[PDB]
């Protein structure tokens, strides 16, 4: 499947933001609503952010949950108070 439109002419909704999709990524085929969406997808790609504090960069990993999976950033600072080893 390609493009940002449904068969009835209604615009697709962004999977990332739920905004109405404006543009379509020809390389991967993932339509995106906004520049932020595209950047987030690209950061999901390019797992080794070749800047060559490097470990502190946003590193999304996929975790398998009952009947599906989610993307989690291991660099996410958890809420203040998390114990050692959290």
């Amino acid at each position: 499947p390609t493009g940002v439109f449904l068969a009835n002419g209604i615009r697709k909704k962004c999977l990332i933001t739920n905004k109405e999709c404006q543009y379509f990524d020809p390389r991967t085929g993932v339509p995106y609503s906004d520049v932020e969406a595209y950047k987030i997808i690209q950061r999901i790609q390019d797992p080794i952010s070749k800047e060559e504090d490097s470990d502190d960069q946003v590193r999304f990993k996929w975790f398998g949950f009952k009947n599906g999976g989610i993307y989690l950033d291991l660099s996410q600072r958890p809420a203040k108070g998390v114990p050692e080893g959290f």
């Binding site: 739920n18 991967t28 080794i48 949950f65 599906g68 999976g69 989610i70 989690l72 958890p78």
Partner: protein, 322 residues
């Protein structure tokens, strides 16, 4: 589950129905004829799955679901509407994904009775001791925004908060009491963290068995003449656990107090979490292989494509139902 059982020795495993490996994918070493991400769509499938799961996952305990249809069950909809109070609209981020929410209070009747008793006591104490200025309207607006109106004045502490998805109003979930809440005054962002156990049903059922055993022992002793914590118990099955963290944005000062009061005493849950962290099995982190070989993985590729087609075919009807 019915997804095609991968041929033996593929350089990937099927996790949550998708090809993934613990190590970072090395396409260049492993693939001779890699299909494009366009051709594979694995990334697309992953993203749709992620969003949907976030809409339907186990992060927050479910408490109300719209009943799947002169049946009086229609009349219960306004009752369920009134049993909650209506509160203002706020944004939530889930991993790379973001969602929006309106807020709803679950009416604790004990707080209502105690508020009536407190007003009675205060009245009796007081009896025993004994154009229009728009700036005043602005002052009242600001006061009601950072101080509390009557419903907020009663539901400051011990109020119960329900979450709902504005893109999927069909399910309502409990805000985790066993959670760490940080209110960022500078950014107006709130980060919530909690530990989650994938076999929690197993632990709860074994807990019930232990409770029955202790009750039977006490009954046997009585025939002659309790903060039961499953996580502390030596015979508790291994928790497969994950730690989770999420950020809220868009909540207003007055609501923060209600939220801040609502969560549990921090040290107790911290100690419980530390026990969970010693006893728990952490979920392993792995990497999706978004690119597949057109020849060795033809069946898998087409299967994914078909399932995506069906998903999209269903997705149109969702708005067509509105």
């Amino acid at each position: 589950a019915s997804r095609a059982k991968l041929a033996t020795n593929r350089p990937f495993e099927i996790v949550a129905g998708l090809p993934a490996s613990v190590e970072l994918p090395n396409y260049n070493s492993s693939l001779t004829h890699p299909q494009s991400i366009k051709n594979s769509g694995v990334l697309y499938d992953s993203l749709v799955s992620s969003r949907r799961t976030w809409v339907q996952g186990e992060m927050f305990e479910l408490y109300w679901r719209r009943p799947k249809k002169e049946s009086p069950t229609s009349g219960t909809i306004p009752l369920i509407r009134d049993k909650m109070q209506k509160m203002c609209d706020c944004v939530m981020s889930g991993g790379p994904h973001t969602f929006k929410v309106r807020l709803f209070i679950l009416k604790n009747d004990k707080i209502e009775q105690k508020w009536q008793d407190e007003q009675e006591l205060k009245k009796k104490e007081k009896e025993l001791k004994r154009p229009k200025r728009k700036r005043r309207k602005n002052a009242i607006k600001e006061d009601k925004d950072m101080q509390l109106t009557a419903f907020q004045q009663k539901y400051v502490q011990g109020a119960e908060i329900i979450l709902e998805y504005l893109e999927f109003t069909h399910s309502r979930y409990y805000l985790p009491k066993k959670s760490v809440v940080e209110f960022l005054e500078d950014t107006d962002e709130i980060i919530i963290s909690w530990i989650v156990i994938h076999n929690s049903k197993e632990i709860e059922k074994f807990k019930t068995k232990k409770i029955k055993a202790k009750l039977k022992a006490d009954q046997k002793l009585n025939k002659e003449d309790v903060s039961f914590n499953p996580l502390f118990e030596a015979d508790c099955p291994t928790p497969l656990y994950t730690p989770m963290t999420m950020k809220l944005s868009g909540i207003h000062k007055r609501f923060n107090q209600i939220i801040r009061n609502s969560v549990s005493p921090m040290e107790e849950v911290v100690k419980e979490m530390e026990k969970i962290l010693q006893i728990g099995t952490r979920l392993s982190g792995y990497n999706l292989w978004y690119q597949l070989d057109g020849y060795d993985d033809e069946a898998l590729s087409e299967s994914l494509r078909f399932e995506l087609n069906e998903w999209e075919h269903a997705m149109r009807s969702r708005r067509h139902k509105r």
